[PDB]
Every structure is written in C-alpha cells, then in structure tokens.
mmCIF file of C-alpha atoms in Angstrom:
data_model
loop_
_atom_site.group_PDB
_atom_site.id
_atom_site.type_symbol
_atom_site.label_atom_id
_atom_site.label_comp_id
_atom_site.label_asym_id
_atom_site.label_seq_id
_atom_site.Cartn_x
_atom_site.Cartn_y
_atom_site.Cartn_z
ATOM 1 C CA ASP A 1 74.301 24.992 -51.524
ATOM 2 C CA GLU A 2 76.386 27.535 -53.291
ATOM 3 C CA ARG A 3 75.682 30.096 -50.729
ATOM 4 C CA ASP A 4 76.554 27.415 -48.367
ATOM 5 C CA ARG A 5 79.927 27.150 -50.108
ATOM 6 C CA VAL A 6 80.211 30.897 -49.471
ATOM 7 C CA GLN A 7 78.574 31.100 -46.057
ATOM 8 C CA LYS A 8 80.947 28.418 -44.919
ATOM 9 C CA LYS A 9 84.038 30.429 -46.309
ATOM 10 C CA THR A 10 82.815 33.656 -44.614
ATOM 11 C CA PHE A 11 81.909 32.006 -41.153
ATOM 12 C CA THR A 12 85.199 30.282 -41.243
ATOM 13 C CA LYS A 13 87.069 33.483 -42.023
ATOM 14 C CA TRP A 14 84.918 35.211 -39.264
ATOM 15 C CA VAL A 15 85.788 32.611 -36.660
ATOM 16 C CA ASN A 16 89.506 32.462 -37.513
ATOM 17 C CA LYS A 17 89.622 36.201 -37.025
ATOM 18 C CA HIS A 18 88.535 35.871 -33.455
ATOM 19 C CA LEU A 19 90.421 32.627 -32.510
ATOM 20 C CA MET A 20 93.483 34.514 -33.946
ATOM 21 C CA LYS A 21 93.482 36.502 -30.515
ATOM 22 C CA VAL A 22 94.121 33.347 -28.515
ATOM 23 C CA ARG A 23 96.389 31.512 -31.101
ATOM 24 C CA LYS A 24 93.624 28.939 -32.202
ATOM 25 C CA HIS A 25 92.612 28.177 -35.785
ATOM 26 C CA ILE A 26 90.245 26.196 -37.949
ATOM 27 C CA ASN A 27 90.553 24.858 -41.501
ATOM 28 C CA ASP A 28 87.233 22.784 -42.068
ATOM 29 C CA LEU A 29 84.294 24.241 -39.950
ATOM 30 C CA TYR A 30 82.432 20.995 -40.480
ATOM 31 C CA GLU A 31 85.367 19.177 -38.577
ATOM 32 C CA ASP A 32 87.131 21.541 -36.375
ATOM 33 C CA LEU A 33 84.403 22.283 -34.218
ATOM 34 C CA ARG A 34 83.161 18.873 -33.347
ATOM 35 C CA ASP A 35 85.140 18.493 -30.043
ATOM 36 C CA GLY A 36 83.768 21.656 -28.592
ATOM 37 C CA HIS A 37 87.097 23.338 -27.830
ATOM 38 C CA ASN A 38 87.222 26.080 -30.443
ATOM 39 C CA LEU A 39 83.601 27.011 -29.912
ATOM 40 C CA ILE A 40 84.321 27.512 -26.386
ATOM 41 C CA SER A 41 87.345 29.477 -26.923
ATOM 42 C CA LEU A 42 85.322 31.546 -29.506
ATOM 43 C CA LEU A 43 82.652 32.345 -26.988
ATOM 44 C CA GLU A 44 85.380 33.302 -24.213
ATOM 45 C CA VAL A 45 87.049 35.543 -26.810
ATOM 46 C CA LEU A 46 83.549 37.275 -27.884
ATOM 47 C CA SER A 47 82.024 37.430 -24.210
ATOM 48 C CA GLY A 48 85.189 38.248 -22.144
ATOM 49 C CA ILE A 49 84.234 35.323 -19.688
ATOM 50 C CA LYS A 50 85.926 32.061 -18.757
ATOM 51 C CA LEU A 51 83.979 28.956 -19.603
ATOM 52 C CA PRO A 52 84.443 25.465 -18.004
ATOM 53 C CA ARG A 53 85.814 22.617 -20.099
ATOM 54 C CA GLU A 54 85.667 18.724 -20.025
ATOM 55 C CA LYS A 55 89.009 17.077 -20.268
ATOM 56 C CA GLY A 56 88.876 13.820 -22.221
ATOM 57 C CA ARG A 57 88.950 12.491 -25.624
ATOM 58 C CA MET A 58 85.814 10.276 -25.813
ATOM 59 C CA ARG A 59 82.736 11.499 -27.782
ATOM 60 C CA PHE A 60 80.773 12.275 -24.588
ATOM 61 C CA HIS A 61 83.615 14.584 -23.527
ATOM 62 C CA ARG A 62 82.864 16.127 -27.002
ATOM 63 C CA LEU A 63 79.153 16.254 -26.587
ATOM 64 C CA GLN A 64 79.621 17.701 -23.253
ATOM 65 C CA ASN A 65 82.103 20.556 -24.337
ATOM 66 C CA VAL A 66 79.513 21.409 -27.040
ATOM 67 C CA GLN A 67 76.763 21.473 -24.538
ATOM 68 C CA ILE A 68 78.589 23.736 -22.363
ATOM 69 C CA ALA A 69 78.678 26.218 -25.267
ATOM 70 C CA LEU A 70 74.915 25.585 -26.144
ATOM 71 C CA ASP A 71 73.968 26.431 -22.378
ATOM 72 C CA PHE A 72 75.995 29.396 -22.329
ATOM 73 C CA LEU A 73 73.973 30.686 -25.303
ATOM 74 C CA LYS A 74 70.685 29.553 -23.767
ATOM 75 C CA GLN A 75 71.371 31.092 -20.666
ATOM 76 C CA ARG A 76 71.974 34.578 -22.487
ATOM 77 C CA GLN A 77 68.428 33.895 -23.729
ATOM 78 C CA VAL A 78 69.879 33.109 -27.389
ATOM 79 C CA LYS A 79 67.172 30.968 -29.295
ATOM 80 C CA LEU A 80 68.726 27.857 -30.752
ATOM 81 C CA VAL A 81 66.212 26.174 -32.830
ATOM 82 C CA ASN A 82 67.047 22.515 -33.775
ATOM 83 C CA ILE A 83 70.587 22.666 -32.874
ATOM 84 C CA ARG A 84 71.621 19.870 -30.465
ATOM 85 C CA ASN A 85 75.160 18.868 -29.255
ATOM 86 C CA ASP A 86 75.401 15.906 -31.336
ATOM 87 C CA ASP A 87 74.389 17.717 -34.360
ATOM 88 C CA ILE A 88 77.768 19.673 -33.730
ATOM 89 C CA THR A 89 80.010 16.818 -32.496
ATOM 90 C CA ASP A 90 78.737 14.800 -35.796
ATOM 91 C CA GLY A 91 79.567 17.518 -38.148
ATOM 92 C CA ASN A 92 76.208 18.514 -39.335
ATOM 93 C CA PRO A 93 76.818 21.357 -42.036
ATOM 94 C CA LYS A 94 73.678 23.061 -41.949
ATOM 95 C CA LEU A 95 73.348 23.098 -38.100
ATOM 96 C CA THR A 96 76.856 23.971 -37.720
ATOM 97 C CA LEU A 97 76.383 26.975 -39.823
ATOM 98 C CA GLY A 98 73.330 27.814 -38.087
ATOM 99 C CA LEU A 99 75.185 27.775 -34.728
ATOM 100 C CA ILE A 100 78.011 30.113 -35.974
ATOM 101 C CA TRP A 101 75.218 32.431 -37.377
ATOM 102 C CA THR A 102 73.445 32.530 -33.979
ATOM 103 C CA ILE A 103 76.858 33.272 -32.484
ATOM 104 C CA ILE A 104 77.521 36.164 -35.042
ATOM 105 C CA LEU A 105 73.954 37.453 -34.749
ATOM 106 C CA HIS A 106 74.280 37.545 -30.888
ATOM 107 C CA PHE A 107 77.711 39.035 -30.365
ATOM 108 C CA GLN A 108 78.500 41.110 -33.412
ATOM 109 C CA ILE A 109 75.249 42.065 -35.422
ATOM 110 C CA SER A 110 72.931 42.744 -32.445
ATOM 111 C CA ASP A 111 74.971 45.341 -30.674
ATOM 112 C CA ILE A 112 74.116 48.276 -32.906
ATOM 113 C CA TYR A 113 72.315 51.595 -32.211
ATOM 114 C CA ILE A 114 70.874 54.015 -34.852
ATOM 115 C CA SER A 115 69.063 57.154 -33.983
ATOM 116 C CA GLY A 116 65.947 56.703 -35.953
ATOM 117 C CA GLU A 117 65.440 53.156 -34.767
ATOM 118 C CA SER A 118 62.413 51.693 -32.487
ATOM 119 C CA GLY A 119 62.703 49.277 -29.805
ATOM 120 C CA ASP A 120 61.177 46.759 -32.064
ATOM 121 C CA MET A 121 63.535 46.544 -35.114
ATOM 122 C CA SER A 122 65.563 43.588 -35.480
ATOM 123 C CA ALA A 123 69.318 44.012 -35.644
ATOM 124 C CA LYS A 124 69.068 43.146 -39.324
ATOM 125 C CA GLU A 125 66.536 45.989 -39.758
ATOM 126 C CA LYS A 126 68.723 48.574 -37.896
ATOM 127 C CA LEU A 127 71.788 47.787 -39.766
ATOM 128 C CA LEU A 128 69.795 48.036 -43.132
ATOM 129 C CA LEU A 129 68.673 51.439 -41.748
ATOM 130 C CA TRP A 130 72.132 52.569 -41.056
ATOM 131 C CA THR A 131 73.130 51.707 -44.499
ATOM 132 C CA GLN A 132 70.356 53.734 -45.915
ATOM 133 C CA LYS A 133 71.308 56.698 -43.766
ATOM 134 C CA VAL A 134 75.065 56.461 -44.566
ATOM 135 C CA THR A 135 74.480 56.094 -48.278
ATOM 136 C CA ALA A 136 71.669 58.674 -48.606
ATOM 137 C CA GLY A 137 72.904 61.313 -51.249
ATOM 138 C CA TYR A 138 74.591 58.760 -53.638
ATOM 139 C CA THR A 139 73.000 57.666 -56.887
ATOM 140 C CA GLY A 140 71.389 54.348 -56.589
ATOM 141 C CA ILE A 141 67.957 52.665 -56.038
ATOM 142 C CA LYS A 142 67.071 52.417 -52.313
ATOM 143 C CA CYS A 143 68.816 49.476 -50.394
ATOM 144 C CA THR A 144 66.187 47.086 -48.993
ATOM 145 C CA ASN A 145 68.212 43.956 -48.635
ATOM 146 C CA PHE A 146 71.514 42.398 -47.787
ATOM 147 C CA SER A 147 71.915 40.449 -51.097
ATOM 148 C CA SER A 148 71.173 41.696 -54.624
ATOM 149 C CA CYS A 149 71.374 45.649 -53.384
ATOM 150 C CA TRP A 150 75.112 44.771 -52.673
ATOM 151 C CA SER A 151 76.083 42.801 -55.673
ATOM 152 C CA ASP A 152 77.226 45.943 -57.945
ATOM 153 C CA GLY A 153 79.680 46.916 -55.339
ATOM 154 C CA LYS A 154 78.401 50.431 -55.324
ATOM 155 C CA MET A 155 76.866 50.291 -51.775
ATOM 156 C CA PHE A 156 80.162 49.268 -50.459
ATOM 157 C CA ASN A 157 81.827 51.948 -51.935
ATOM 158 C CA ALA A 158 79.490 54.520 -50.682
ATOM 159 C CA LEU A 159 79.622 53.377 -47.181
ATOM 160 C CA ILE A 160 83.446 53.978 -47.083
ATOM 161 C CA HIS A 161 83.175 57.397 -49.239
ATOM 162 C CA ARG A 162 80.914 58.673 -46.319
ATOM 163 C CA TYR A 163 83.526 58.064 -43.842
ATOM 164 C CA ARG A 164 86.747 58.538 -46.082
ATOM 165 C CA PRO A 165 85.640 60.571 -49.100
ATOM 166 C CA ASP A 166 89.522 60.991 -49.745
ATOM 167 C CA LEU A 167 89.973 57.353 -50.396
ATOM 168 C CA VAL A 168 87.173 56.620 -52.892
ATOM 169 C CA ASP A 169 86.074 58.368 -56.209
ATOM 170 C CA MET A 170 82.340 57.777 -56.374
ATOM 171 C CA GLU A 171 82.197 59.211 -60.031
ATOM 172 C CA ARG A 172 84.422 56.422 -61.156
ATOM 173 C CA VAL A 173 82.303 53.927 -59.098
ATOM 174 C CA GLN A 174 79.423 54.771 -61.592
ATOM 175 C CA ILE A 175 80.831 53.227 -64.633
ATOM 176 C CA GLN A 176 83.445 50.708 -63.422
ATOM 177 C CA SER A 177 82.349 46.935 -63.413
ATOM 178 C CA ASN A 178 80.977 45.259 -60.438
ATOM 179 C CA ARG A 179 84.313 43.329 -59.807
ATOM 180 C CA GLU A 180 86.361 46.354 -59.905
ATOM 181 C CA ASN A 181 83.917 48.190 -57.539
ATOM 182 C CA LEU A 182 83.741 45.205 -55.211
ATOM 183 C CA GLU A 183 87.407 44.617 -55.323
ATOM 184 C CA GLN A 184 88.487 48.065 -54.487
ATOM 185 C CA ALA A 185 86.079 48.371 -51.779
ATOM 186 C CA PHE A 186 87.223 45.277 -50.030
ATOM 187 C CA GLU A 187 90.790 46.695 -50.486
ATOM 188 C CA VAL A 188 90.075 50.001 -48.968
ATOM 189 C CA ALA A 189 88.025 48.645 -46.249
ATOM 190 C CA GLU A 190 90.847 46.579 -45.338
ATOM 191 C CA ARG A 191 93.162 49.576 -44.764
ATOM 192 C CA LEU A 192 90.569 50.925 -42.409
ATOM 193 C CA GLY A 193 90.737 47.752 -40.456
ATOM 194 C CA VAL A 194 88.089 45.742 -41.902
ATOM 195 C CA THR A 195 88.893 42.024 -42.259
ATOM 196 C CA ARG A 196 88.028 40.713 -45.770
ATOM 197 C CA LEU A 197 85.485 37.937 -44.945
ATOM 198 C CA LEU A 198 84.234 38.283 -48.746
ATOM 199 C CA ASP A 199 85.770 37.574 -52.273
ATOM 200 C CA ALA A 200 84.564 39.831 -55.069
ATOM 201 C CA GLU A 201 83.762 36.850 -57.215
ATOM 202 C CA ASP A 202 81.306 35.499 -54.658
ATOM 203 C CA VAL A 203 79.338 38.587 -54.379
ATOM 204 C CA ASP A 204 79.212 39.434 -58.046
ATOM 205 C CA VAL A 205 76.063 37.355 -58.479
ATOM 206 C CA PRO A 206 72.530 38.127 -58.852
ATOM 207 C CA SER A 207 71.761 36.900 -55.169
ATOM 208 C CA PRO A 208 74.780 37.149 -52.941
ATOM 209 C CA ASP A 209 74.387 35.206 -49.622
ATOM 210 C CA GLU A 210 72.600 37.449 -47.115
ATOM 211 C CA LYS A 211 74.094 36.168 -43.880
ATOM 212 C CA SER A 212 77.672 36.550 -45.437
ATOM 213 C CA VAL A 213 76.877 40.130 -46.644
ATOM 214 C CA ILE A 214 75.276 41.288 -43.262
ATOM 215 C CA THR A 215 78.299 39.873 -41.280
ATOM 216 C CA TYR A 216 80.652 41.915 -43.535
ATOM 217 C CA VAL A 217 78.434 45.153 -43.796
ATOM 218 C CA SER A 218 78.228 44.866 -39.787
ATOM 219 C CA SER A 219 81.898 44.482 -39.557
ATOM 220 C CA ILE A 220 82.538 47.720 -41.535
ATOM 221 C CA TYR A 221 80.118 49.378 -39.015
ATOM 222 C CA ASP A 222 82.254 48.029 -36.277
ATOM 223 C CA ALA A 223 85.261 49.771 -37.710
ATOM 224 C CA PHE A 224 83.988 53.248 -38.182
ATOM 225 C CA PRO A 225 83.639 56.064 -35.661
ATOM 226 C CA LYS A 226 80.440 55.883 -33.944
ATOM 227 C CA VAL A 227 78.329 58.156 -31.875
ATOM 228 C CA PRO A 228 77.212 56.161 -28.574
ATOM 229 C CA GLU A 229 73.344 56.446 -27.732
ATOM 230 C CA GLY A 230 72.408 59.944 -26.711
ATOM 231 C CA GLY A 231 75.964 60.670 -25.798
ATOM 232 C CA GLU A 232 78.053 63.612 -27.126
ATOM 233 C CA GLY A 233 79.890 62.885 -30.532
ATOM 234 C CA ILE A 234 80.241 63.650 -34.273
ATOM 235 C CA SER A 235 78.565 61.802 -36.885
ATOM 236 C CA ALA A 236 80.208 61.485 -40.360
ATOM 237 C CA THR A 237 77.706 63.879 -41.531
ATOM 238 C CA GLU A 238 78.662 66.429 -38.995
ATOM 239 C CA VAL A 239 82.385 66.210 -39.369
ATOM 240 C CA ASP A 240 83.290 68.467 -42.256
ATOM 241 C CA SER A 241 81.245 71.213 -40.599
ATOM 242 C CA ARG A 242 82.578 70.547 -37.069
ATOM 243 C CA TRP A 243 86.100 70.532 -38.331
ATOM 244 C CA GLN A 244 85.604 73.961 -39.992
ATOM 245 C CA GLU A 245 83.858 75.306 -36.866
ATOM 246 C CA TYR A 246 87.145 74.222 -34.961
ATOM 247 C CA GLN A 247 89.683 75.809 -37.148
ATOM 248 C CA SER A 248 87.610 78.913 -37.249
ATOM 249 C CA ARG A 249 87.352 79.197 -33.577
ATOM 250 C CA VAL A 250 91.227 78.868 -33.338
ATOM 251 C CA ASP A 251 91.700 81.304 -36.166
ATOM 252 C CA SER A 252 89.593 83.740 -34.035
ATOM 253 C CA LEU A 253 90.962 83.398 -30.544
ATOM 254 C CA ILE A 254 94.718 82.742 -31.141
ATOM 255 C CA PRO A 255 95.333 86.164 -33.034
ATOM 256 C CA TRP A 256 93.239 87.882 -30.196
ATOM 257 C CA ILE A 257 95.430 86.391 -27.585
ATOM 258 C CA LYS A 258 98.397 87.607 -29.704
ATOM 259 C CA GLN A 259 97.158 91.189 -30.385
ATOM 260 C CA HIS A 260 95.842 91.448 -26.865
ATOM 261 C CA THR A 261 99.041 90.316 -25.328
ATOM 262 C CA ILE A 262 101.217 92.895 -26.828
ATOM 263 C CA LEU A 263 99.170 95.534 -24.981
ATOM 264 C CA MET A 264 100.507 93.904 -21.794
ATOM 265 C CA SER A 265 104.156 94.323 -22.453
ATOM 266 C CA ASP A 266 104.020 97.967 -22.755
ATOM 267 C CA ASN A 267 91.312 100.185 -12.730
ATOM 268 C CA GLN A 268 90.004 99.063 -15.994
ATOM 269 C CA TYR A 269 92.532 96.286 -15.805
ATOM 270 C CA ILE A 270 89.851 94.696 -13.678
ATOM 271 C CA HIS A 271 87.256 94.779 -16.789
ATOM 272 C CA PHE A 272 89.983 93.732 -19.282
ATOM 273 C CA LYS A 273 89.914 90.575 -17.121
ATOM 274 C CA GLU A 274 86.581 89.757 -15.071
ATOM 275 C CA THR A 275 84.778 90.545 -18.466
ATOM 276 C CA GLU A 276 86.603 89.562 -21.661
ATOM 277 C CA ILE A 277 89.071 87.272 -20.176
ATOM 278 C CA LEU A 278 86.290 85.285 -18.398
ATOM 279 C CA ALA A 279 84.690 85.013 -22.089
ATOM 280 C CA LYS A 280 88.075 84.594 -24.198
ATOM 281 C CA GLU A 281 88.996 82.035 -21.551
ATOM 282 C CA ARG A 282 85.614 80.156 -22.145
ATOM 283 C CA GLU A 283 86.368 80.133 -25.838
ATOM 284 C CA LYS A 284 89.665 78.234 -25.045
ATOM 285 C CA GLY A 285 87.401 75.896 -23.200
ATOM 286 C CA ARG A 286 84.938 75.489 -25.918
ATOM 287 C CA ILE A 287 87.784 74.933 -28.316
ATOM 288 C CA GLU A 288 89.875 72.311 -26.266
ATOM 289 C CA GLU A 289 86.531 70.689 -25.624
ATOM 290 C CA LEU A 290 85.572 70.272 -29.281
ATOM 291 C CA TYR A 291 89.027 68.956 -30.401
ATOM 292 C CA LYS A 292 88.173 66.108 -28.009
ATOM 293 C CA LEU A 293 85.244 65.180 -30.068
ATOM 294 C CA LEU A 294 87.363 65.366 -33.077
ATOM 295 C CA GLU A 295 90.231 63.184 -31.768
ATOM 296 C CA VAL A 296 88.415 59.972 -33.033
ATOM 297 C CA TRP A 297 88.325 61.417 -36.680
ATOM 298 C CA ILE A 298 91.889 62.526 -36.602
ATOM 299 C CA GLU A 299 92.790 58.957 -35.464
ATOM 300 C CA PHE A 300 90.453 57.263 -38.009
ATOM 301 C CA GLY A 301 92.479 59.485 -40.630
ATOM 302 C CA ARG A 302 89.635 61.693 -41.885
ATOM 303 C CA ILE A 303 91.494 64.840 -40.523
ATOM 304 C CA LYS A 304 94.846 65.602 -40.765
ATOM 305 C CA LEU A 305 95.614 68.054 -37.829
ATOM 306 C CA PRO A 306 97.608 70.895 -39.177
ATOM 307 C CA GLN A 307 100.275 72.313 -37.175
ATOM 308 C CA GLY A 308 99.304 75.042 -34.720
ATOM 309 C CA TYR A 309 95.853 73.642 -34.308
ATOM 310 C CA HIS A 310 96.223 71.673 -31.049
ATOM 311 C CA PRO A 311 94.260 72.770 -28.031
ATOM 312 C CA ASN A 312 97.918 73.125 -26.508
ATOM 313 C CA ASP A 313 98.995 75.619 -29.241
ATOM 314 C CA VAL A 314 96.250 77.866 -27.766
ATOM 315 C CA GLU A 315 97.185 77.204 -24.058
ATOM 316 C CA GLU A 316 100.842 78.402 -25.064
ATOM 317 C CA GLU A 317 99.670 81.806 -26.024
ATOM 318 C CA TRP A 318 97.008 82.016 -23.187
ATOM 319 C CA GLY A 319 99.984 81.285 -20.765
ATOM 320 C CA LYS A 320 101.837 84.261 -22.423
ATOM 321 C CA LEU A 321 98.708 86.310 -22.012
ATOM 322 C CA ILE A 322 98.803 85.200 -18.238
ATOM 323 C CA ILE A 323 102.282 86.382 -17.745
ATOM 324 C CA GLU A 324 101.974 89.750 -19.008
ATOM 325 C CA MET A 325 98.845 90.063 -17.267
ATOM 326 C CA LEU A 326 100.848 89.471 -13.930
ATOM 327 C CA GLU A 327 103.481 91.933 -14.897
ATOM 328 C CA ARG A 328 101.016 95.027 -15.284
ATOM 329 C CA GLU A 329 99.184 93.415 -12.335
ATOM 330 C CA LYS A 330 101.693 94.237 -9.747
ATOM 331 C CA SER A 331 102.070 97.607 -11.468
ATOM 332 C CA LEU A 332 98.612 98.780 -11.216
ATOM 333 C CA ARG A 333 98.623 97.743 -7.428
ATOM 334 C CA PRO A 334 99.734 100.604 -5.216
#
C-alpha cells in the first residue's frame, strides 16, 4: 500500500511523459483514466496508430472507450487478467495500476535485446541481465532483483558510469550515503535524457517497489546508445578501444598523405597508384566507415571529436594527393 503510493506516483509520471507529446495530462490516475480518452491517447502515442473513439458523455460511452483500449491490447496478444472496462471507468486503484503496468510492460520494457539472451527469458530477466553485464567490474554483490539491489543507489551510478565515466566518480559513490547516490544518479541521468520517474526518498528503503524500479531502469536503457541485434555497432565496452583505433588510424594515414603529396609537387607512377593508392584509399574507407559507428557516441557526449579528426579532414588531404597525382600524370604521359 506504500508501494502503491509510489507505483501510482511513478506510473502517473510515466503516463504524463507520453501524454505530453499530444498536450494531454493527468493529475489523479484513479480519476483521469475513467472516461477512456487518455488511455486511448496513450496507446496512440505509444503504438503510432490511430484508434477509434466514442463521442458522448454517458457512462456506457466511458465503458466503450475503455473497451476500445482493452481490445486493442488483447488483439496484440497482451494478457489482461481480471481487468474489465468497468474496473477502469469506476476507478479501481489496483486494476488501474495493473493496466498501466501491462501497457508499460508491453510497449517499453518488452522491446529489449541483449546478446547473451535466450528466446525464453522474460523482458524482466533480459533487462536484469543487461544491468549485470553493464555493471560487471564495479564493487558490489550481484544484482538479482529490481528492488533491494537498487536501494543504496550504487547500481544506478554504475549504469551511468559505464556510459559516461566522466560524469560519475565511482570511488566517492562507495562511501556516500544512499540518498546522495540516488539523488546524484537521478540528476545526471536526467541530463542524459532520462525523465525522473523516481524520488530518492522512495527508493532509499529496504524493498523499493519493483515495478517502479524496472520502469525507470528500462527507461535508462532506452536513453543509452545501443547495438541493434546482430547489426554492426559499438557497445559501451568497446568504445574506448575503438576510439583509440580510430585516432591512431588517422594519425597513420593523414601524415602519409602529407609526406607522400610533397613528392608529387616536385612507369613506376603506375605502381605508386594501382598498389599503394588502392591500399591507402582503402584505409581512408576503413576510417570514414568506423567514424560512422562512432557518431552515436559523439552525439551521446562520450567522445569529444577533436579538430582534424573528421573523415573529411582526411578527404581534404586525399584530394590534394589526387591533384598533384594528376599534374605528374600528364607529364609521365608522352
């Protein structure tokens, strides 16, 4: 009933987050969903599809608008146990929360991939596994739930540090109080685009509300750069290493294009071209292609791209090498 206080607070904040996009809003979850209009709007926002509506302001209009939402969920094979339209239109607290949870679970939490997963892991289990992989390497017991494991605030800070090590000091997190750790995690996460669904004072308890924590943790996962399934991309564990690869690659090619462009200003001129140039060109290609995978991390703020490291800055010296290549081309041409 205190987790209900908190779950309601979280689910309200979560709902308002999405209604914001269409200029809708709720104050009391147990009242402002009863006519079916905001439930529908929420589903339209979340799903990207347009739903029908019953105009009218009798109770059966209310019941039908709720039913339109329930059917839409049932049709997408969502399981609605015990929830019926009159439960919603009449304000049933426990079933209103269950319905929001069902929506959250289906639209936000369920769309997660984790290399290391099975086909038969729940979303909850997959998300748990992500947190374990991300925070592997920080001091702490293993995370096996979405309640007590999160109450001291250290997990939150580790999640963030993995993605933005410059924004968190994990040493200090070891000896700060739970409240300080929680407060500063929510704060920083906000800067990185994570809406504050939780209040530090509600999580600093022995058993924080699981559905609230999952919703927030899942939301952090949404905000962070991700590698799509099987696709090409860079995880938070590979970034430092790829970023160094990249810079080193440039620090190798650029000055070869510069020291091998001066030779062109002053019969083997066919080997200095169908051999090396086809290789050095390929470097330029390997480079510009790697930069593409890095863009995400540059936009995310993890990498500050120093000047003279864009794939362009390479093309502008490769162009210069193409010119002086053409000068001494028409000359060794008789």
